[PDB]
């Protein structure tokens, strides 16, 4: 395709492989967990604001409800002291409060549902982060398994992955050669008969 | 780490029965509201118990393999420690035979 | 089911 695209792909493919060699599992696992938790903390605060707004809405609902009964009581006080004028006017105004109570409760319900969903999501996130925090230890166990098995293979005769075995086998061969030298020097410079007793018994 | 995982599994299992008991207490004192809510929440604990035990099993298998590998390594090192003495015996054989030829 | 219990 293009040319500049190709050059930049090569440069990128080199830098990325340079970086991916520096990453070390034991530390980057912890770094990932740390940032995971940081993000969870920053989400808690959003949930908290949601809850506070719900409290405010319910308080407004309660106050409107209280004023409804207040103006009913004012109507009754008019009936006791005043006349039909004030008694009817109290309820005339109470119309608005009765309207607003329902107009507000409708939205208060949805607000409550939203807060419930948010709380559920927060709990789910906490659980998943805990799962990851266990997986980290499982991965460390896997690292140890890998190194132990690599230790075992280094113990075999024909491979030289381990320096200790290298030295051990080298000395073994040196000594076997020395003994062979002695035996050859023995040869160089220089049971039928006793099997007869087996016939005696 | 395996011990930790099993402990978490046990605690979740205990909380399942705890919330069942809370539901029963609701049935004794409260009403269907709390009795049903207890199990509504217990749903999550029943989920997490299995979600955790699944991984606990693999963790146990890994620990078993690691223990086996450690025993194998110990055995092989002991074998090498015997081979060392056998090699010293060979050194002595070589020197004795070289002594004989010099005669 | 618990709703049946109570």
mmCIF file of C-alpha atoms in Angstrom:
data_model
loop_
_atom_site.group_PDB
_atom_site.id
_atom_site.type_symbol
_atom_site.label_atom_id
_atom_site.label_comp_id
_atom_site.label_asym_id
_atom_site.label_seq_id
_atom_site.Cartn_x
_atom_site.Cartn_y
_atom_site.Cartn_z
ATOM 1 C CA UNK A 1 0.000 0.000 0.000
ATOM 2 C CA UNK A 2 1.379 3.430 0.926
ATOM 3 C CA UNK A 3 5.011 4.051 1.823
ATOM 4 C CA UNK A 4 4.841 6.284 4.887
ATOM 5 C CA UNK A 5 2.298 3.885 6.345
ATOM 6 C CA UNK A 6 4.783 1.053 5.870
ATOM 7 C CA UNK A 7 7.698 2.947 7.417
ATOM 8 C CA UNK A 8 5.660 3.880 10.459
ATOM 9 C CA UNK A 9 4.412 0.313 10.812
ATOM 10 C CA UNK A 10 8.020 -0.873 10.916
ATOM 11 C CA UNK A 11 9.040 1.743 13.481
ATOM 12 C CA UNK A 12 6.021 0.931 15.635
ATOM 13 C CA UNK A 13 6.621 -2.808 15.391
ATOM 14 C CA UNK A 14 10.130 -2.196 16.649
ATOM 15 C CA UNK A 15 9.240 0.090 19.562
ATOM 16 C CA UNK A 16 6.430 -2.177 20.735
ATOM 17 C CA UNK A 17 8.674 -5.222 20.837
ATOM 18 C CA UNK A 18 11.233 -3.121 22.677
ATOM 19 C CA UNK A 19 8.673 -2.285 25.374
ATOM 20 C CA UNK A 20 7.122 -5.741 25.646
ATOM 21 C CA UNK A 21 10.525 -7.076 26.683
ATOM 22 C CA UNK A 22 10.721 -4.718 29.677
ATOM 23 C CA UNK A 23 7.368 -5.788 31.125
ATOM 24 C CA UNK A 24 7.838 -8.211 34.035
ATOM 25 C CA UNK A 25 4.842 -10.324 35.131
ATOM 26 C CA UNK A 26 5.314 -10.189 38.892
ATOM 27 C CA UNK A 27 5.224 -6.381 38.947
ATOM 28 C CA UNK A 28 2.757 -5.587 36.182
ATOM 29 C CA UNK A 29 0.179 -7.876 37.763
ATOM 30 C CA UNK A 30 0.352 -5.757 40.910
ATOM 31 C CA UNK A 31 0.259 -2.520 38.926
ATOM 32 C CA UNK A 32 -2.852 -3.664 37.080
ATOM 33 C CA UNK A 33 -4.523 -4.544 40.379
ATOM 34 C CA UNK A 34 -3.615 -1.173 41.864
ATOM 35 C CA UNK A 35 -5.179 0.746 38.992
ATOM 36 C CA UNK A 36 -8.206 -1.565 39.087
ATOM 37 C CA UNK A 37 -8.823 -0.555 42.694
ATOM 38 C CA UNK A 38 -8.233 3.125 41.979
ATOM 39 C CA UNK A 39 -10.979 3.051 39.359
ATOM 40 C CA UNK A 40 -13.362 1.289 41.726
ATOM 41 C CA UNK A 41 -12.770 4.000 44.323
ATOM 42 C CA UNK A 42 -13.555 6.713 41.810
ATOM 43 C CA UNK A 43 -16.838 4.966 40.931
ATOM 44 C CA UNK A 44 -17.959 4.799 44.564
ATOM 45 C CA UNK A 45 -18.239 8.583 44.613
ATOM 46 C CA UNK A 46 -20.649 8.645 41.694
ATOM 47 C CA UNK A 47 -22.851 6.121 43.413
ATOM 48 C CA UNK A 48 -22.783 8.265 46.551
ATOM 49 C CA UNK A 49 -24.039 11.318 44.671
ATOM 50 C CA UNK A 50 -26.858 9.265 43.198
ATOM 51 C CA UNK A 51 -27.913 8.225 46.693
ATOM 52 C CA UNK A 52 -27.756 11.781 48.026
ATOM 53 C CA UNK A 53 -29.973 13.045 45.217
ATOM 54 C CA UNK A 54 -32.474 10.319 46.053
ATOM 55 C CA UNK A 55 -32.535 11.454 49.683
ATOM 56 C CA UNK A 56 -33.225 15.011 48.556
ATOM 57 C CA UNK A 57 -36.076 13.935 46.296
ATOM 58 C CA UNK A 58 -37.757 11.882 49.013
ATOM 59 C CA UNK A 59 -37.446 14.782 51.455
ATOM 60 C CA UNK A 60 -39.178 17.104 48.996
ATOM 61 C CA UNK A 61 -41.932 14.525 48.548
ATOM 62 C CA UNK A 62 -42.391 14.308 52.317
ATOM 63 C CA UNK A 63 -42.553 18.085 52.704
ATOM 64 C CA UNK A 64 -45.202 18.434 50.000
ATOM 65 C CA UNK A 65 -47.180 15.631 51.637
ATOM 66 C CA UNK A 66 -46.967 17.417 54.996
ATOM 67 C CA UNK A 67 -48.142 20.704 53.483
ATOM 68 C CA UNK A 68 -51.181 18.932 52.017
ATOM 69 C CA UNK A 69 -52.300 18.003 55.528
ATOM 70 C CA UNK A 70 -51.285 21.448 56.780
ATOM 71 C CA UNK A 71 -53.680 23.142 54.376
ATOM 72 C CA UNK A 72 -56.380 20.602 55.191
ATOM 73 C CA UNK A 73 -55.939 21.625 58.837
ATOM 74 C CA UNK A 74 -56.126 25.275 57.781
ATOM 75 C CA UNK A 75 -59.435 24.506 56.061
ATOM 76 C CA UNK A 76 -60.681 22.878 59.269
ATOM 77 C CA UNK A 77 -59.552 25.933 61.250
ATOM 78 C CA UNK A 78 -61.537 28.070 58.814
ATOM 79 C CA UNK A 79 -64.561 25.805 59.466
ATOM 80 C CA UNK A 80 -64.041 26.288 63.254
ATOM 81 C CA UNK A 81 -63.418 30.061 63.206
ATOM 82 C CA UNK A 82 -63.885 31.481 59.708
ATOM 83 C CA UNK A 83 -66.498 30.616 57.088
ATOM 84 C CA UNK A 84 -66.889 28.730 53.804
ATOM 85 C CA UNK A 85 -64.678 31.316 52.091
ATOM 86 C CA UNK A 86 -61.397 30.399 53.796
ATOM 87 C CA UNK A 87 -62.459 26.764 54.214
ATOM 88 C CA UNK A 88 -62.862 26.393 50.449
ATOM 89 C CA UNK A 89 -59.814 28.527 49.613
ATOM 90 C CA UNK A 90 -57.564 26.253 51.669
ATOM 91 C CA UNK A 91 -58.502 23.271 49.501
ATOM 92 C CA UNK A 92 -58.405 25.432 46.365
ATOM 93 C CA UNK A 93 -54.702 25.926 47.044
ATOM 94 C CA UNK A 94 -54.276 22.338 48.280
ATOM 95 C CA UNK A 95 -55.105 21.263 44.725
ATOM 96 C CA UNK A 96 -51.604 22.257 43.612
ATOM 97 C CA UNK A 97 -49.869 20.348 46.398
ATOM 98 C CA UNK A 98 -51.889 17.223 45.656
ATOM 99 C CA UNK A 99 -50.787 17.548 42.027
ATOM 100 C CA UNK A 100 -47.112 18.063 42.837
ATOM 101 C CA UNK A 101 -46.992 15.141 45.266
ATOM 102 C CA UNK A 102 -47.781 12.614 42.529
ATOM 103 C CA UNK A 103 -45.801 14.508 39.890
ATOM 104 C CA UNK A 104 -42.757 14.133 42.148
ATOM 105 C CA UNK A 105 -43.316 10.581 43.381
ATOM 106 C CA UNK A 106 -43.445 9.356 39.792
ATOM 107 C CA UNK A 107 -39.813 10.402 39.309
ATOM 108 C CA UNK A 108 -38.769 9.403 42.826
ATOM 109 C CA UNK A 109 -39.608 5.810 41.911
ATOM 110 C CA UNK A 110 -37.308 5.764 38.877
ATOM 111 C CA UNK A 111 -34.571 7.419 40.913
ATOM 112 C CA UNK A 112 -34.852 4.613 43.456
ATOM 113 C CA UNK A 113 -34.566 1.982 40.729
ATOM 114 C CA UNK A 114 -31.439 3.661 39.363
ATOM 115 C CA UNK A 115 -29.809 3.748 42.789
ATOM 116 C CA UNK A 116 -30.557 0.056 43.273
ATOM 117 C CA UNK A 117 -28.963 -0.856 39.950
ATOM 118 C CA UNK A 118 -25.903 1.226 40.788
ATOM 119 C CA UNK A 119 -25.480 -0.501 44.148
ATOM 120 C CA UNK A 120 -25.722 -3.887 42.450
ATOM 121 C CA UNK A 121 -23.091 -2.902 39.888
ATOM 122 C CA UNK A 122 -20.718 -1.714 42.592
ATOM 123 C CA UNK A 123 -20.988 -5.031 44.428
ATOM 124 C CA UNK A 124 -20.353 -6.923 41.194
ATOM 125 C CA UNK A 125 -17.222 -4.900 40.498
ATOM 126 C CA UNK A 126 -15.911 -5.568 43.983
ATOM 127 C CA UNK A 127 -16.407 -9.295 43.512
ATOM 128 C CA UNK A 128 -14.618 -9.337 40.160
ATOM 129 C CA UNK A 129 -11.645 -7.397 41.512
ATOM 130 C CA UNK A 130 -11.372 -9.934 44.321
ATOM 131 C CA UNK A 131 -11.389 -12.730 41.748
ATOM 132 C CA UNK A 132 -8.539 -11.046 39.894
ATOM 133 C CA UNK A 133 -6.634 -10.669 43.150
ATOM 134 C CA UNK A 134 -6.857 -14.432 43.605
ATOM 135 C CA UNK A 135 -5.834 -15.118 40.007
ATOM 136 C CA UNK A 136 -2.654 -13.167 40.674
ATOM 137 C CA UNK A 137 -1.570 -15.648 43.338
ATOM 138 C CA UNK A 138 -2.526 -18.557 41.106
ATOM 139 C CA UNK A 139 -0.266 -17.099 38.402
ATOM 140 C CA UNK A 140 2.612 -16.816 40.852
ATOM 141 C CA UNK A 141 2.099 -20.494 41.650
ATOM 142 C CA UNK A 142 2.336 -21.227 37.928
ATOM 143 C CA UNK A 143 5.608 -19.284 37.707
ATOM 144 C CA UNK A 144 7.049 -21.419 40.479
ATOM 145 C CA UNK A 145 5.854 -24.604 38.776
ATOM 146 C CA UNK A 146 7.602 -23.549 35.581
ATOM 147 C CA UNK A 147 10.887 -22.822 37.331
ATOM 148 C CA UNK A 148 10.776 -26.073 39.313
ATOM 149 C CA UNK A 149 10.191 -28.129 36.197
ATOM 150 C CA UNK A 150 13.007 -26.318 34.400
ATOM 151 C CA UNK A 151 15.215 -27.164 37.367
ATOM 152 C CA UNK A 152 14.315 -30.839 37.025
ATOM 153 C CA UNK A 153 15.167 -31.041 33.330
ATOM 154 C CA UNK A 154 18.559 -29.458 33.917
ATOM 155 C CA UNK A 155 19.378 -32.565 35.962
ATOM 156 C CA UNK A 156 19.359 -34.946 32.978
ATOM 157 C CA UNK A 157 22.655 -36.190 31.560
ATOM 158 C CA UNK A 158 22.505 -34.942 27.980
ATOM 159 C CA UNK A 159 21.432 -31.296 28.323
ATOM 160 C CA UNK A 160 23.363 -28.304 29.604
ATOM 161 C CA UNK A 161 20.724 -25.832 30.751
ATOM 162 C CA UNK A 162 22.094 -25.747 34.320
ATOM 163 C CA UNK A 163 25.648 -24.690 35.117
ATOM 164 C CA UNK A 164 25.832 -26.956 38.168
ATOM 165 C CA UNK A 165 25.096 -30.030 36.066
ATOM 166 C CA UNK A 166 27.519 -28.788 33.439
ATOM 167 C CA UNK A 167 30.336 -28.760 35.991
ATOM 168 C CA UNK A 168 29.263 -32.026 37.600
ATOM 169 C CA UNK A 169 29.159 -33.931 34.313
ATOM 170 C CA UNK A 170 32.430 -32.392 33.166
ATOM 171 C CA UNK A 171 34.225 -33.639 36.275
ATOM 172 C CA UNK A 172 32.533 -37.025 35.951
ATOM 173 C CA UNK A 173 33.835 -37.436 32.406
ATOM 174 C CA UNK A 174 37.293 -36.254 33.427
ATOM 175 C CA UNK A 175 37.480 -38.905 36.144
ATOM 176 C CA UNK A 176 36.147 -41.665 33.906
ATOM 177 C CA UNK A 177 38.814 -40.757 31.359
ATOM 178 C CA UNK A 178 41.494 -40.904 34.049
ATOM 179 C CA UNK A 179 40.386 -44.388 35.099
ATOM 180 C CA UNK A 180 40.319 -45.491 31.469
ATOM 181 C CA UNK A 181 43.878 -44.219 31.089
ATOM 182 C CA UNK A 182 44.928 -46.314 34.061
ATOM 183 C CA UNK A 183 43.241 -49.420 32.651
ATOM 184 C CA UNK A 184 44.806 -48.967 29.220
ATOM 185 C CA UNK A 185 48.222 -48.531 30.798
ATOM 186 C CA UNK A 186 47.550 -51.773 32.645
ATOM 187 C CA UNK A 187 46.808 -53.633 29.432
ATOM 188 C CA UNK A 188 49.672 -52.105 27.464
ATOM 189 C CA UNK A 189 52.644 -53.095 29.623
ATOM 190 C CA UNK A 190 51.086 -56.372 30.790
ATOM 191 C CA UNK A 191 36.822 -70.342 35.042
ATOM 192 C CA UNK A 192 36.595 -73.871 33.675
ATOM 193 C CA UNK A 193 39.323 -75.199 35.983
ATOM 194 C CA UNK A 194 37.578 -74.089 39.203
ATOM 195 C CA UNK A 195 34.123 -74.744 37.645
ATOM 196 C CA UNK A 196 35.091 -78.425 38.132
ATOM 197 C CA UNK A 197 34.301 -78.250 41.857
ATOM 198 C CA UNK A 198 30.724 -77.439 40.835
ATOM 199 C CA UNK A 199 30.622 -81.027 39.571
ATOM 200 C CA UNK A 200 31.889 -82.316 42.928
ATOM 201 C CA UNK A 201 28.739 -81.112 44.710
ATOM 202 C CA UNK B 1 -2.696 -19.071 48.583
ATOM 203 C CA UNK B 2 -4.650 -22.321 48.482
ATOM 204 C CA UNK B 3 -5.411 -22.007 52.195
ATOM 205 C CA UNK B 4 -6.689 -18.478 51.632
ATOM 206 C CA UNK B 5 -8.936 -19.553 48.771
ATOM 207 C CA UNK B 6 -10.477 -22.403 50.752
ATOM 208 C CA UNK B 7 -11.100 -20.076 53.696
ATOM 209 C CA UNK B 8 -12.956 -17.643 51.444
ATOM 210 C CA UNK B 9 -15.022 -20.526 50.083
ATOM 211 C CA UNK B 10 -15.902 -21.613 53.620
ATOM 212 C CA UNK B 11 -16.906 -18.096 54.652
ATOM 213 C CA UNK B 12 -19.203 -17.672 51.652
ATOM 214 C CA UNK B 13 -20.735 -21.069 52.401
ATOM 215 C CA UNK B 14 -21.335 -20.023 56.016
ATOM 216 C CA UNK B 15 -22.975 -16.760 54.949
ATOM 217 C CA UNK B 16 -25.359 -18.706 52.700
ATOM 218 C CA UNK B 17 -26.695 -20.541 55.748
ATOM 219 C CA UNK B 18 -26.599 -17.313 57.755
ATOM 220 C CA UNK B 19 -28.972 -15.613 55.332
ATOM 221 C CA UNK B 20 -31.155 -18.716 55.210
ATOM 222 C CA UNK B 21 -31.408 -18.422 59.003
ATOM 223 C CA UNK B 22 -32.226 -14.728 58.609
ATOM 224 C CA UNK B 23 -35.052 -15.705 56.252
ATOM 225 C CA UNK B 24 -36.324 -18.171 58.857
ATOM 226 C CA UNK B 25 -36.128 -15.450 61.519
ATOM 227 C CA UNK B 26 -38.193 -13.244 59.214
ATOM 228 C CA UNK B 27 -40.728 -16.107 58.930
ATOM 229 C CA UNK B 28 -40.809 -16.348 62.776
ATOM 230 C CA UNK B 29 -40.996 -12.600 63.518
ATOM 231 C CA UNK B 30 -41.303 -10.583 60.306
ATOM 232 C CA UNK B 31 -43.319 -11.337 57.174
ATOM 233 C CA UNK B 32 -42.881 -12.527 53.584
ATOM 234 C CA UNK B 33 -41.066 -9.280 52.761
ATOM 235 C CA UNK B 34 -37.910 -9.924 54.795
ATOM 236 C CA UNK B 35 -38.224 -13.697 54.365
ATOM 237 C CA UNK B 36 -38.056 -13.333 50.582
ATOM 238 C CA UNK B 37 -35.447 -10.552 50.666
ATOM 239 C CA UNK B 38 -33.048 -12.761 52.623
ATOM 240 C CA UNK B 39 -33.051 -15.339 49.825
ATOM 241 C CA UNK B 40 -33.013 -12.584 47.193
ATOM 242 C CA UNK B 41 -29.616 -11.580 48.559
ATOM 243 C CA UNK B 42 -28.602 -15.210 49.178
ATOM 244 C CA UNK B 43 -28.726 -15.643 45.400
ATOM 245 C CA UNK B 44 -25.401 -13.817 45.085
ATOM 246 C CA UNK B 45 -23.671 -15.923 47.730
ATOM 247 C CA UNK B 46 -24.874 -19.135 46.107
ATOM 248 C CA UNK B 47 -23.412 -17.857 42.832
ATOM 249 C CA UNK B 48 -20.062 -16.865 44.324
ATOM 250 C CA UNK B 49 -19.638 -20.162 46.169
ATOM 251 C CA UNK B 50 -19.520 -22.156 42.927
ATOM 252 C CA UNK B 51 -17.665 -19.420 41.043
ATOM 253 C CA UNK B 52 -14.924 -19.703 43.671
ATOM 254 C CA UNK B 53 -14.872 -23.476 44.130
ATOM 255 C CA UNK B 54 -14.280 -23.920 40.408
ATOM 256 C CA UNK B 55 -10.921 -22.153 40.736
ATOM 257 C CA UNK B 56 -10.146 -23.664 44.138
ATOM 258 C CA UNK B 57 -10.083 -27.075 42.460
ATOM 259 C CA UNK B 58 -7.458 -26.062 39.895
ATOM 260 C CA UNK B 59 -5.414 -24.404 42.624
ATOM 261 C CA UNK B 60 -5.417 -27.686 44.534
ATOM 262 C CA UNK B 61 -4.236 -29.586 41.462
ATOM 263 C CA UNK B 62 -1.387 -27.117 40.964
ATOM 264 C CA UNK B 63 -0.262 -27.459 44.573
ATOM 265 C CA UNK B 64 -0.269 -31.243 44.248
ATOM 266 C CA UNK B 65 1.892 -31.129 41.129
ATOM 267 C CA UNK B 66 4.311 -28.750 42.829
ATOM 268 C CA UNK B 67 4.658 -31.040 45.842
ATOM 269 C CA UNK B 68 5.356 -33.978 43.543
ATOM 270 C CA UNK B 69 8.023 -32.014 41.678
ATOM 271 C CA UNK B 70 9.727 -31.012 44.910
ATOM 272 C CA UNK B 71 9.933 -34.633 46.043
ATOM 273 C CA UNK B 72 11.360 -35.653 42.672
ATOM 274 C CA UNK B 73 14.056 -32.994 42.886
ATOM 275 C CA UNK B 74 15.023 -34.132 46.362
ATOM 276 C CA UNK B 75 15.390 -37.703 45.148
ATOM 277 C CA UNK B 76 17.560 -36.711 42.190
ATOM 278 C CA UNK B 77 19.859 -34.592 44.348
ATOM 279 C CA UNK B 78 20.302 -37.571 46.656
ATOM 280 C CA UNK B 79 21.204 -39.719 43.654
ATOM 281 C CA UNK B 80 23.846 -37.192 42.638
ATOM 282 C CA UNK B 81 25.197 -37.169 46.180
ATOM 283 C CA UNK B 82 25.719 -40.921 45.902
ATOM 284 C CA UNK B 83 27.314 -40.635 42.460
ATOM 285 C CA UNK B 84 29.897 -38.324 43.992
ATOM 286 C CA UNK B 85 31.133 -41.072 46.305
ATOM 287 C CA UNK B 86 31.107 -43.568 43.455
ATOM 288 C CA UNK B 87 33.333 -41.187 41.476
ATOM 289 C CA UNK B 88 35.750 -40.908 44.382
ATOM 290 C CA UNK B 89 35.928 -44.703 44.404
ATOM 291 C CA UNK B 90 36.787 -44.579 40.703
ATOM 292 C CA UNK B 91 39.576 -42.072 41.387
ATOM 293 C CA UNK B 92 41.070 -44.444 43.928
ATOM 294 C CA UNK B 93 40.802 -47.362 41.500
ATOM 295 C CA UNK B 94 42.680 -45.357 38.887
ATOM 296 C CA UNK B 95 45.487 -44.431 41.263
ATOM 297 C CA UNK B 96 45.814 -47.991 42.576
ATOM 298 C CA UNK B 97 46.079 -49.415 39.086
ATOM 299 C CA UNK B 98 48.654 -46.785 38.143
ATOM 300 C CA UNK B 99 50.594 -47.822 41.234
ATOM 301 C CA UNK B 100 50.543 -51.443 40.086
ATOM 302 C CA UNK B 101 51.882 -50.704 36.610
ATOM 303 C CA UNK B 102 54.759 -48.690 38.033
ATOM 304 C CA UNK B 103 55.950 -51.957 39.589
ATOM 305 C CA UNK C 1 -40.371 -20.764 47.325
ATOM 306 C CA UNK C 2 -39.683 -19.106 50.687
ATOM 307 C CA UNK C 3 -42.937 -17.199 50.163
ATOM 308 C CA UNK C 4 -44.609 -20.588 50.615
ATOM 309 C CA UNK C 5 -42.705 -21.169 53.866
ATOM 310 C CA UNK C 6 -44.460 -18.233 55.554
#
